[PDB]
């Protein structure tokens, strides 16, 4: 097709949003974490990061096939060009959506809100996150709705470092008396050249190398190596 690139990019963004929403209302029950889309000549590959790769793959390799068909009617993409790859996540306890859905299913599986929040707090610190908050709001008791917070570790709330040092997941949880809201915010730790943290430190953090402990010479000498 011939197309102005501005419209191309906004339509591509709408395409990504459509994928994300369809799979969030679709693939959530399978430990959904996220989706990465690769563009290759005349085809688009859809790698799925999800903690439950066996659930999404399913028996007989059924469901992971069917999805490729179900999008094909809506997007109108060429046949054969669309394919998806279901992978297990590389960010288990540091992808906010993963433990947000986890908490969703704890609350759905007859587990207390405070106990579930404490458990995910424990798990998140076991992963090694510098801090976590779980803002759960709703009618936790009676009919007077209220909020409820579980903050531990530390957490930055302002500035650019929030975008990449904080993973934020806002989800709606089913309840008998209404709809609860869950906000799971994880402050990602820092590791360099690693796979669990951003490659740059907090800009307000200054780290100093300890200087060498060389003994000061007291008489000039000629060293032959």
């Amino acid at each position: 097709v011939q197309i102005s690139k501005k419209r191309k990019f906004v339509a591509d963004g709408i395409f990504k949003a459509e994928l994300n929403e369809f799979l969030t209302r679709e693939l959530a029950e399978d430990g959904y974490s996220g989706v990465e889309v690769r563009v290759t000549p005349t085809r688009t590959e859809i790698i799925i990061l999800a903690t439950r790769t066996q659930n999404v793959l399913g028996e007989k390799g059924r469901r992971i096939r069917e999805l490729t068909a179900v999008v094909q009617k809506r997007f109108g993409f060429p046949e054969g060009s669309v394919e998806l790859y279901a992978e297990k996540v590389a960010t288990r306890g540091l992808c906010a959506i993963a433990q947000a859905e986890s908490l969703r299913y704890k609350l759905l599986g007859g587990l207390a809100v405070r106990r579930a929040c404490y458990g995910v707090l424990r798990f998140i610190m076991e992963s090694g996150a510098k801090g976590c908050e779980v803002v759960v709001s709703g009618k936790l008791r009676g009919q007077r709705a209220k909020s409820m917070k579980f903050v531990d570790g530390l957490m930055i709330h302002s500035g650019d470092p929030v975008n990449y040092y904080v993973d934020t997941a806002v989800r709606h949880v089913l309840l008998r008396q209404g709809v609860l809201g869950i906000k799971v915010k994880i402050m990602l730790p820092w590791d360099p050249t690693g796979k669990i943290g951003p490659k740059k430190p907090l800009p307000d953090h200054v780290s100093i190398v300890e200087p060498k402990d060389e003994i000061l010479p007291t008489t000039p000498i000629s060293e032959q190596k």
Binding site: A112, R114, R115, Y118, L140, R141
Partner: peptide
Amino acid sequence: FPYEVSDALQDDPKGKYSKKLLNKLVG
């Protein structure tokens, strides 16, 4: 640790069940 009783206590320190939870935690 009975985190159930403690968490129910922190839900309502002065609740209708507060005395029962406080008594449960004692011991």
